[PDB]
Design a protein around this ligand. Structure first.
Ligand SMILES: O=C(O)[C@@](O)(COP(=O)(O)O)[C@H](O)[C@H](O)COP(=O)(O)O
Ligand SMILES: O=C(O)[C@@](O)(COP(=O)(O)O)[C@H](O)[C@H](O)COP(=O)(O)O
Ligand SMILES: O=C(O)[C@@](O)(COP(=O)(O)O)[C@H](O)[C@H](O)COP(=O)(O)O
Ligand SMILES: [Mg+2]
Ligand SMILES: [Mg+2]
Ligand SMILES: [Mg+2]
Ligand SMILES: [Mg+2]
Lengths: 464, 123, 464, 464, 159, 151
């Protein structure tokens, strides 16, 4: 209370534009890229985004006096012009800790991005980054396991982990799936996996696929003498269904399951991360639907946020993009968020799109996955851009090799070891790239067959 | 087109898909490790060349991952040559051992590297 | 099989562009509005969209011969130029039934929108509509109850249902939340509800909120002699959490719960709808996050699809927009999806954005909710646009009344009953609107007070 | 409503005879073979059958005006004379989707066959066929596994699977049953099984039989190096008992169970199919009691319907008849429903008794089983009539061999492999039948012993 | 009788450093102590589940390692697995995992956990065949001064 | 690792006395009131209390080089004399968050008070206060209800 209740509308500006404000170390901060509507002062646009995101509505309600908005109000503490840009700004908003439910990305998302993106007063809105305070980070479980334990479990060090998505996407039988799996794995891939839309359909039922890929990976691991795994997709239509599948994988002794976190949802993911933690499965996150949110530079949510959100809710691996392949993605930005995915502390670096220093107070890091339209000739670049702490996946690039899967595997495994040694001997994957695999193509019949096939392919197209 | 054989190609993780590493080549490795700050360490096994699952099958459990430490992690060492020495030193004594070389990143606590330094006869 | 395996890339066009195609009654069809990249022929764009959405990848894989893509391939059976538009088209794709897991919106979305929106070859992609076949409709539960049984249960006929969102957004204590609730409902509101972001927080914990709102709705119901309800937010961070809250609302005997389906997720929503169905709770859906996906006319998903997705997943109420208030929404489009939400069959009508005839084979219909920045002076319009089968909500519009909640409730009940009778006597809500409430304001003290306060407010701003 | 409520009786004809009617793709259609009572015009008969099967009773009730019968009424849209038949017709009835509970054969049969068979106005009624629309098919789980996955699982291809029913029917001890089982199995049969009335009795209790038959099939499989299985009968008196046994087979790791679907019932059947689905057991259905319904040509239910009913409820195997053995069954009809059991689409062919095109929209198909009074000399015909996708069973034909079970096994195996190669070499099982086995009896000692014993046996008797 | 050990003190080792070792290194260190001839290795009483190493991870690896060492030596081995946790539910839950691994002993800091939780644990152990080692952390807070507190002979009776 | 493993005992003081230290906002801080044994320099007593409370023991173990104590060691960053008091001091110790199990007071006490009160080198020890950081606070449920709700 204090100050009479005076009914009626007032600009947002009056309460949620606070340039005065001194951020608290426990505040959630957000960098929104706002583009107002013609007559809207940025500081009003900016104040609406903060109000309608925290404590306020469009008119004056007496109830405010029951509590104290100074404590609760979300607040726009600064605007910045987007240099060389169409009436577009960076409104910075700070959200007090007290506003968020502990352990819940769902909650956090409901607040920050709940309703503001549809304001009539704005024409476009996009969240670029969020500063998650340690006081909030400590309330999440985060990854079931993270980078070190994963390596430690599968016993695998020095070099990118290799994987392949069986294809065709849909239409293969429980049994063919197995066949294909075994064949890719014995070749020398570390993992094979279900395509993100392989759940349980009339052509192949989850329980059938799960039973045979278990048979197969077990065959391929005995054969090679190297721990193998096949990502078994637990994405389902109901949490009960979802857990039920994760439960079978556990019954089989297999090591990793997978889940489409955005089509599944944060509420369901969080549940699976907990289930994995307690049951010891590694969980692979697939980011289906994402580009629906993260493509346009003017409206939506940037992937670096989507990525943060996942290290929070739970996942051992997350698909981070390839720079160099079939889907969109620039190098600097990717580098930025990949550190957001694996490091303990990441210093703010506008160069790379990181608007805030992120301190993860030891939440496990997540292994980024490079996938989609990549082949043998990209090896040295991937290797370069990502480092050993990455998973590199060959779908088309494995089942696409002229002599079948086993060989297609062997090709990739050599391509990569090749690149890895070049690197270690001191070669320069960026300059010297091309000779290196070129060189190895010469000594490897399977590697060769590959080289010849995808030699001329690139996906150069001017990015969004 | 040729059938990748199904029979005597047991692997050893990193580098086991390239041709047998020459001592020079191998040297490059211990060299890299070093270059980076990893403490080199050695472990040998004379009986279970590969993972198994005899005691348990829960997810993630596999018997045969742990190997025997050869002496201690050579903290402070900077002589690439000295670790190589050790390899020699162990095939002498465990001729039938599988010997490997690993690199500890103590700040991250991860084995930043590992490559087999020596398979026994007929592997 | 048949036709030698011939490794290598080929244009999508060769298999996914099939203008020949005669759509089967059981095919899922999707109208995508595609904007290619400069050198991309629409028919290639369109086929990339169909291949990378059903059965194929970027290069040739022998496995296709194991199955038969004629049966399974997703196929682009037609393109259309977007009259008076920047190299933008309507690619129309057809997905055979066999590809989707029964009952799972999760799976459907994973397929249709999984990866295609981030193709380098495209610069913008947007799903405008999806035709759900009766063979797939029948695999869904749909709403726990739907329009008829909800009216039947609450005993309410001939007029829009009235509701209010308690404000401030965040920051009120369990107790104060109840007080506010009792006060709003005794006034004449049918329902009050949790703000989509009120879950369980330091300032007020879910079980304390639920316990006091029950005490309060029970007080107001007894007082007025009319069934009351308070939407209790079950949105939580894990399914287990979610169910757990749903279970207490059941224990208290209260009649309706609520769930933010998009931040929650389809997996978790569906599980709640089931639980609600079996325990007879009505479910109110809050579409938070939706504008991140549905705003831009060139990229994303259109709400009519999000709307469809929910009628499948399960919801008794869904927010449909207001046209006339604080957030974006145009009248025709709106009328369009509102029919997609409530009617049994909805004839195609490009006028209104409906690209395909939708037959719901008796899936219950969902009650649209009109909310956000609406007041007394909008009554006649809303009534007009939406009719009896709607819920009209007054947040600010209720707690912002000069004489507090009770009177503000009364104000809206009278305004609405006012419009309803005008309508029934044959007046014309659209022409005659303004006098009607204006006339009422004259006889009702509480209504008056309201009229005077929001008289000058409107939210006219040129739409996106 | 509309049209005053006018109390009193009216002929059915007035609302349920609608030759005007244009069937909808989602209608269930039924072809009933009616035989009125002397003074009953077929179109009355026909409308009684349609009324008392959907929405109506014998007098006029006002409630009809509460709803709309046009939506709901079952309707007789055409009669046909049974050429060269005693006042017998084919009334065709159409039932709208809205009338059937999804997933429930129980529901569907309660409607279509609930009360009309006992009308006084009819003297005989018999259902010949039913058209299940895809929108109703998709609501069933169908077989736990189906032909493909069953073969995939057991690793069995190109030829009929062979099996034997241990005899005597009742009176053998748990131990002897196991003895007899190993002995059949080692000889080369794929499966042995419980006689449909072998449940749990004083002479041998289900848990005891299960334990020993497990011992024995495990012996036999080891010995042969060929996956074996023994149908374990789970048919019991209560669902609880039934599942409880299902559960024990699962504990033993055995691969298939069995259930007498008609004496158990649909309700219990479906439970069992679900249980099997989720736990990976194959289910064999035994049609005990069926002939009680399907023999007479003028009254009952035709097995093609009972067979449709099962592919909906769930079964991996179903007995289909033998044509050529101890019990009734004609070749064409059989050919007709066998296709109804295994095919994806079955075009209408009045020749073969199929009155409607049946699309199964991918429901998995069931493996027909040929059993009862068949022997070595029938091999070629069965093989002829059924094809590889069939199970052929030798009860007597196995434990009836002069040198006991093993040898008997061996006999049938050779007989069948014999037929199979002849077929593959291009011989003509039908013309060349007889030499083929005759030839082989020459080279096989066990096979010969056989030939000699059953040479003169046939079961030619003029069919019903 | 169970461990098959007679005539002489049983020998054991607490892995060090106290906190900061990774699940994997803990197992390494454990096999290595055990193969040398110690009967038991164990968790430091403040080793529960922390960011540097989570209880389920340690349990899994220490199982691997004692099983290695026992094979190798031909002498039953065991590694105290710490079940001390923040809630009884958590505590039993870990107890339960050791049981699943077949390992022979668990441990509990009886004073910082409490009697109520201790007794629950003893019962659980009794019925499931695990041996329990009690670690008396906090005790000196009570039993040092000769004029005020509780003498350990009582704390020891209490256990 | 780094710096050869050199077996043998060493004073605690060498690693656990760090008056240099700048406490982090996520550190657990503890004010212990120490009274050493006759020949024990307070900065030893103080380091013993910090070591045997976080990461170390009494002799040198190679394993330390496997991880990094700078991250994990507990650390005595100041001593203060108890004005007008029998060789009694206030040792102040800092414990990095990484050391404590979330939500578990049982864990927190097992570390800070588990073995130190019984060192031979000390004759009396007493915990006077603990600074719990927000980052650890948020890991507890805290009271079922608290003063407002109860009222
Ligand atoms: O289904 C696919 O298209 C892939 O499986 C790769 O198959 P190919 O390797 O044969 O193309 C994609 O990488 C991810 O699934 C795409 O996403 P992301 O950008 O999120 O990695
Ligand atoms: O939180 C809010 O702002 C509301 O609660 C309304 O409060 P007011 O009535 O006080 O504004 C909104 O209608 C919906 O929540 C907005 O979304 P939708 O467009 O999805 O209806
Ligand atoms: O019990 C029996 O008589 C059988 O077991 C056969 O034993 P034999 O092989 O010794 O006759 C019969 O096939 C089915 O059981 C009879 O029915 P169906 O017409 O449905 O197959
Ligand atoms: Mg994929
Ligand atoms: Mg709201
Ligand atoms: Mg029988
Ligand atoms: Mg100790």
């Amino acid at each position: 209370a204090s100050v009479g209740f005076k009914a009626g509308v007032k600009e947002y500006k009056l309460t949620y534009y606070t340039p005065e404000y001194q951020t608290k170390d426990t505040d959630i901060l957000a960098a929104f890229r706002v583009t107002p509507q013609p007559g809207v002062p940025p500081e009003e646009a900016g104040a609406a985004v903060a109000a309608e995101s925290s404590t306020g509505t469009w008119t004056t309600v007496w109830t405010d006096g029951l509590t104290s908005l100074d404590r609760y109000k979300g607040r726009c503490y600064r605007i910045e012009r987007v240099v060389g840009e169409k009436d577009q700004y960076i409104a910075y908003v700070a959200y007090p800790l007290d506003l968020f439910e502990e352990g819940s990305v769902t909650n956090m998302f409901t607040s920050i991005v709940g309703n503001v993106f549809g304001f009539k007063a704005l024409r476009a809105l996009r969240l670029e980054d969020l500063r998650i305070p340690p006081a909030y980070v400590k309330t999440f479980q985060g990854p079931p396991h993270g980078i070190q334990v994963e390596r430690d479990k599968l016993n695998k060090y020095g070099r990118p982990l290799l994987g392949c998505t069986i294809k065709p996407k849909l239409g293969l039988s429980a049994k063919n799936y197995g066949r294909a799996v075994y064949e890719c794995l014995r070749g020398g891939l570390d993992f094979t996996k279900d395509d993100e839309n392989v759940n349980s359909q009339p052509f192949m039922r989850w329980r059938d696929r799960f039973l045979f890929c278990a048979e197969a990976l077990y065959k391929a691991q005995a054969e090679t003498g190297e721990i193998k795994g096949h990502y078994l997709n637990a994405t389902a239509g109901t949490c009960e269904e979802m857990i039920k599948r994760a439960v079978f994988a556990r019954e089989l002794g297999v090591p990793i399951v997978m889940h489409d976190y955005l089509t599944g949802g944060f509420t369901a993911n969080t549940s699976l991360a907990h289930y994995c933690r307690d049951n010891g499965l590694l969980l692979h996150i697939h980011r289906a639907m994402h580009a629906v949110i993260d493509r346009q530079k003017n409206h939506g949510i940037h992937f670096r946020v989507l990525a943060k959100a996942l290290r929070m809710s739970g996942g051992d691996h997350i698909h981070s993009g390839t720079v160099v392949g079939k889907l969109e993605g620039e190098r600097d930005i990717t580098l930025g968020f990949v550190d957001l995915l694996r490091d303990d502390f990441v210093e703010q670096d506008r160069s790379r799109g990181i608007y805030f220093t992120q301190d993860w107070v030891s939440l496990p890091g997540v292994l980024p996955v490079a996938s989609g339209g990549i082949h043998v000739w990209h090896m040295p670049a991937l290797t370069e851009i990502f480092g050993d702490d990455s998973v590199l996946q060959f779908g088309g690039g494995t089942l696409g090799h002229p002599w079948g899967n086993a060989p297609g595997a062997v090709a990739n495994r050599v391509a990569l070891e090749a690149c890895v040694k070049a690197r270690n001997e001191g070669r320069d994957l960026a300059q010297e790239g091309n000779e290196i695999i070129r060189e190895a193509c010469k000594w490897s019949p399977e590697l060769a067959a590959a080289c010849e096939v995808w030699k001329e392919i690139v996906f150069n197209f001017a990015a969004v | 087109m040729q059938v990748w054989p199904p029979i005597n190609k047991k692997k050893y993780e990193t580098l086991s898909y390239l041709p047998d590493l020459s001592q020079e080549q191998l040297l490059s490795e211990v060299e890299y490790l070093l270059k980076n700050g990893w403490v080199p360490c050695l472990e040998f096994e004379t009986e279970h060349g590969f993972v198994y699952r005899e005691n348990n099958k829960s997810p993630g459990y596999y018997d045969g991952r742990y190997w025997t430490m050869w002496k201690l992690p050579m903290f402070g060492c900077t002589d690439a040559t000295q670790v190589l020495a050790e390899v020699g030193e162990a095939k002498k004594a465990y001729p039938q051992a599988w010997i490997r070389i690993i690199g500890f990143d103590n700040v991250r606590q991860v084995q930043c590297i590992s490559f087999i330094a020596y398979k026994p006869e007929g592997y």
